[PDB]
């Protein structure tokens, strides 16, 4: 399938199918393929993949917390090289937020 890595397409996919698109791999999976974060070699070892699916602890409480709710995140707009500052955040009950300023601020998108 073609890469879906935009705020809107990843949000609609998550909302519709309740899972990330297949161009996303978690950081441990990436690491198993030989990703070395400081080398920025993600696209060499896993062509067309983006980091996504890892747990987002929400330590500062900037996303709404509720008992039982877990958050995960995924990189948005990545193609290759070093990672950027855009992330989509999605909960176990399917609330969706984004940030484009490396987690300083968040906007609710679903």
């Amino acid at each position: 399938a073609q890469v879906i890595n935009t705020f809107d397409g990843v949000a609609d996919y998550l909302q519709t199918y309740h899972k990330l698109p297949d161009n996303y791999i978690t950081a441990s999976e990436a690491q198993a393929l030989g990703w070395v974060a400081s080398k920025g070699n993600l696209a060499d070892v896993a062509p067309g993949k983006s980091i996504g699916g890892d747990i987002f602890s929400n330590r500062e409480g900037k996303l709404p917390g509720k008992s039982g709710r877990t958050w995960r995140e995924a990189d948005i707009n990545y193609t290759s090289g070093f990672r950027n500052s855009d992330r989509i955040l999605y909960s176990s009950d399917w609330l969706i937020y984004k940030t484009t300023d490396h987690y300083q601020t968040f906007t609710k998108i679903r």
Binding site: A27, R59, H102
Partner: protein, 90 residues
Amino acid sequence: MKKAVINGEQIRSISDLHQTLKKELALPEYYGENLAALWDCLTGWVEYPLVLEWRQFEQSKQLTENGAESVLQVFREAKAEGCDITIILS
């Protein structure tokens, strides 16, 4: 390996602490200077192995409110999930 030094006595705000980390850990220019951001960098940016030497930790707690401990906690949590981090608290 990567070495980072924090001189606790020079830390006069949670912003100073994030700016020192930005420099010492060679963080992205977009670094969000928050815990979410630091965890993101520790797990998808920073080079390993990493030695963090945190001098005057107690003094850095005074002007960071809960900041210094929250930060240390993120690095401990990174080391708990496999990141190769040595933390020196002096």
